[PDB]
């Protein structure tokens, strides 16, 4: 009976929302707001505690990119701030390996980071690891076989279809089979030993195509596409199904939440977010 948490996002301005959805009863919870509003953040969980990493506060008054790590305990319904990252990271990618949070890529103004840094909850310290081969913002991240994959994004010049693996024990990056489609701002997650990359922006249009990396074969195969095209969308997995959340379809801000069943290979509309938004963080606990 774990919930799908969603933090922040954008609609006219950067948002402070923290909300949880329960697929068993189809209900939404209104939880404690973020201390500082933000969009283009990422979510993750370590030891039952939700973390919200980076992003930016694009308000009416102006724009400030975030280096902040804040931590939310479900049991106490309270946000607590943690040690900040070495640099700010808007459109950040995040993954978890052995209770350590990896901050991947993202931007600060005109700087498009290829750096990566690693958070240790028990010490509350950030340390730089080996940087990625390509600079990436709008980057999907997915932990699989204890390796961290950085998929797609924007390099400062072009939208990317390239992906690359990180090796924590060796501390080094390696390119892998590039994607069928170009995808910046895609939702990237891990279901049944495969990486799925859903949605995103190819350089011209928004996307509903979903493609699946098999590790053994090293090839990306298309699966059934989404009903609603989207970019800068939220994504997670909950009990053997992929959930995509909100986003921007070129015209409007989505509150649609679609759900992928891998057995039937069919997407379906399950619920609506309480208000349409893009650039949310998402995690499950």
């Amino acid at each position: 009976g774990r919930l799908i948490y969603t933090a922040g996002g954008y609609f006219r301005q950067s948002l402070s929302y923290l909300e949880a959805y329960n697929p068993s009863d189809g209900t939404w919870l209104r939880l404690a707001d973020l201390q500082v509003p933000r969009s283009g953040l990422a979510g993750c969980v370590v030891g039952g505690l939700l973390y919200a990493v980076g992003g930016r506060n694009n308000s009416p008054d102006g724009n400030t990119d975030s280096s902040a790590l804040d931590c939310y305990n479900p049991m106490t319904n309270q946000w607590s701030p943690c040690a900040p990252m070495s640099v700010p990271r808007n459109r950040i990618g995040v993954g978890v390996i052995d209770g350590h949070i990896y901050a991947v890529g993202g931007s600060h103004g005109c700087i498009h980071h290829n750096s990566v840094e690693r958070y240790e909850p028990e010490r509350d310290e950030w340390h730089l690891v080996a940087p990625m081969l390509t600079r990436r913002i709008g980057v999907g991240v997915a932990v699989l076989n204890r390796l961290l994959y950085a998929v797609g994004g924007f390099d400062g010049t072009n939208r990317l279809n390239s992906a690359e693996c990180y090796y924590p024990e060796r501390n080094e990056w390696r390119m892998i089979t590039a994607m069928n489609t170009i995808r910046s701002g895609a939702g990237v997650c891990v279901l049944h030993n495969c990486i799925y990359a859903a949605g995103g922006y190819d350089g011209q249009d928004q996307l509903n195509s979903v493609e699946r990396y098999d590790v053994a074969t090293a090839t990306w195969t298309f699966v059934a596409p989404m009903k609603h095209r989207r970019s800068a969308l939220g994504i997670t997995v909950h009990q053997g199904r992929i959930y995509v959340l909100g986003g921007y379809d070129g015209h409007t801000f989505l509150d649609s939440v679609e759900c992928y069943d891998p057995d039937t290979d069919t997407w379906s509309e399950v619920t609506r977010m309480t208000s349409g938004r893009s650039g949310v963080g998402v995690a499950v606990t």
Partner: peptide, 9 residues
Amino acid sequence: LDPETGEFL
């Protein structure tokens, strides 16, 4: 107007 996020910078 960012085409990917829809944010107005």
